[PDB]
Amino acid sequence: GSLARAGKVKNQTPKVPKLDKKKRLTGRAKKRQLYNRRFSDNG
Amino acid sequence: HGASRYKKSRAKMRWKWKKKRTRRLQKKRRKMRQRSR
Amino acid sequence: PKSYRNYSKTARNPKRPFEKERLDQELKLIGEYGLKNKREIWRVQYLLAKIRSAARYLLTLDEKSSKRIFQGEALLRRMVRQGLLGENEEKLDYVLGLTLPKLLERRLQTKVFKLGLAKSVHHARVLIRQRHIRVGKQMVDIPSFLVRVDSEKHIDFATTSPFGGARPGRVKRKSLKKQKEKTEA
Amino acid sequence: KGIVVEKVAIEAKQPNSAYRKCVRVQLIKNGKKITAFVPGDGCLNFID
RNA sequence: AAAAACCGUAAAUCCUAUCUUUUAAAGGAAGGAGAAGUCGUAACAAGGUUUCCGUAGGUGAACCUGCGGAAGGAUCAU
RNA sequence: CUUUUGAUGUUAGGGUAUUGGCCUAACAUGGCUAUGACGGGUAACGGGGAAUUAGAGUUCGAUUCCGGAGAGGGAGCCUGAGAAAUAGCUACCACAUCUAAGGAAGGCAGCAGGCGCGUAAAUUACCCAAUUCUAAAGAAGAGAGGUAGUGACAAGAAAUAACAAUGCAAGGUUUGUAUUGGAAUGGUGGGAAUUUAAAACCUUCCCAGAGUAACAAUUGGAGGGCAAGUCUGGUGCCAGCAGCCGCGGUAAUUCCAGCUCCAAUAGCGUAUAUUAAAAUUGUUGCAGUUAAAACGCUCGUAGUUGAAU
């Protein structure tokens, strides 16, 4: 007899949007970005 | 199960008395079956 | 009823999905050969495992066994034709030593980058996609094209490509320039 | 596929402490009564 | 040609019997799970009567006692 | 177990296209069985094959081909070279259609399609052009078959950029990286060649046709297993998460969210089943003093195994 609390924190969570950012590039260019950001800058 | 009855390491009821109680229950059940049939 | 057209897989999933060293070397390979996705090197390992299993089975047989002097020579000549083996090779043991880079060297993008044309491996990939390259009398826009030892001699720009002698440049920009010149004059 | 009979809260085990929101379903194949857990946080009130 | 009879092939229905599967049920008796419930202290220390086995009887319960075994004993030993 | 009611065999016959207990008459008492008969179960059509496989193995095979069987369930029959035929007939049972009530007519487990059942499966499309069959055999038909439609069942290839300059970082004037700014190219729209039975698709050619290339990639996670945050808010044993171990009672690396990151990627989760993992079914190849497991003991038939020459 405690089904009235379903979704308590779901409903109590403050609502914030997801903003805009840049379009997240995909595909072969994503792999090239991971590759060079992993092996180039580090020294 | 098999022949590893008793072996009280678990700290349980004594197997001999468990067997005796089960046998008493079986005797009662057999008597009830005989009465019914 | 059911069509009799055969079809089969080309890649095998790795198992143990999060092996750090395997992931790192895969990233090395795909980044430095400019390929697009983890499926590609898996197809390459699938192929290489096929030749490797063939070679292992052949090497299990004794010498002078007709099965050997047939299948082994067929495999050897096929490998030297695809360019994975040099003239210094004569045995199947040398086949057994084939590696992933030695198989990735024959990709079309890798070959065009090596020969020039594109100053980047990704530039080579994108050019192949934009169908600017020819293997002689025939134009292919498949970057995973594997070239043979009789093909690298005639890899060059497609005749219908702007870099191959076709339509020079941006028709929009050219028309705008000519219209502006005509209006000014 | 089944028909919801009613919602019910079920205790968690002793080390835990929670009222998992499950439902009781009468299946259509056989009319058998089963208990099915409703995943998600607030999904219990989203079923009739 | 109808029609009929007789052997034969023989659907189908009914009776009876058996078997298989499912299922109701007063009452009875288990098992498992839950909670801080009640009563005791059985086992683990020589667990405060060493423990256990088979069997038999008894008791609110764990259990107790008799007979014969075992050490997995608390003894590898005048 | 079988054997009155054919079970096993003999003799004679009947019947068949032919042999035969296939059936009849007489006679005999045989026939099978722990090397599993006779029964029961199968969510069992068999095989060619499929998945997984180091080698063994384990599981699957309704389903392209072959063989078998069936046309709601049984039985019977005509024609015919060939049928116990079912888009042939006859009857019964169960359904079910029209009827003027007297009577007629039916069989989608063919192709579409509908209802129902369900977790679970497409268009009441086009054509005989290809393959092939039937005919009185170019020329007619063929829901055989082919074509298209629906189709993230599976399978293959493969976009979501690339490049040059400064500014920044790293290095002795080489790499990565926010600005600019021109090329390349598909997706898409249109016309055409072509293809096609017709059409569509592919391919090819010509016009338009990308800068936030808005022509924007998602799914699942970030304690361990297991790659990736003790970052920030909310909740505070509640809500919830969690395959397992566990997290949650005011610093929650695990819940609810934002950011970031990780993995796979036009694919990614979930459920169930199955295979490997499993040398946890062990012939290869397990274990049996104490973890599960040497029969209380001996004899003993079947079985298994057996000195040398």
Closest nucleotide (C1' vs CA) to A5 is F239
The reply to whether C97 falls in a domain is yes
**What's the Cα-to-Cα distance from C25 to each of A9, C20, C39, C52, C103, rounded to whole Å?**
44, 9, 14, 20, 15
- Quick one: C135 exposed, middle or buried, by C-beta within 10 A (0-12, 13-18, 19+)? buried
User: Does some domain include residue C135?
Assistant: yes
User: Using H for helix, E for strand and C for coil, what is the string for C40-84?
Assistant: HHHHHHHHHHHHHHHHHHHHHCCCCCHHHHHHHHHHHHHHHHHCC
Instruction: Tell me the C-alpha distance between C51 and C96, whole Å.
Output: 8
CA–CA–CA angle A27, A31, A34 (5° rounding): 135
Residue identified by tokens 């390992």 is: C45
| Angstroms from A42 CA to nearest CA on chain C | 15
**Does A37 lie at the interface with C, CB-CB under 8 angstroms?**
no
Burial class of residue A23 (count of CB atoms within 10 Å of its CB; 0-12, 13-18, 19+): exposed
Question: What is the nearest nucleotide to C176, using C1' and CA?
Answer: F182
Number of structural domains in chain C = 1
CB-closest option in C27, C36, C37 to A38: C27
Structure tokens at D42: 């607030």
Under 8 Å CB-to-CB from A40, ≥6 apart: which residues? none
Chains touching chain B at 3 or more Cβ pairs under 8 angstroms?
Answer: none
Distance (Å, whole) CA C105 – CA C121: 12
Residue C149: domain span: 17-185
In a domain, C1, yes or no: no
Asked whether residue C39 is assigned to any structural domain, the reply reads yes
Contacts of A35 (CB under 8 A, 6+ apart): C27, C28, C30, C31, C32
Measured in whole angstroms, the distance separating CA D43 from the mean position of its chain's CA atoms is: 11
Q: CA C68, CA B32: separation in Å to the nearest integer?
A: 81
The answer to whether C162 and C168 have CB atoms below 8 angstroms apart is yes
Chain C positions touching A40 (Cβ under 8 A) are: none
Residue C7 domain flag? no
Asked if residue B14 keeps its beta carbon closer than 7 A to nucleic acid strand E, the reply is: yes
- To one decimal, the resolution in angstroms is 2.4
- The closest alpha carbon to C92, from C76, C81, C108, C78, belongs to C76
Q: Which of A26, A28, A39 is the best mutation test for C, with the most CBs of C within 10 A?
A: A28
Query: Is B27 (CB) below 7 Å from strand E?
Result: no
Look at strands C156-157 and C133-134 and give their pairing. antiparallel
| Tokens (6 digits) for D10 | 């079920």
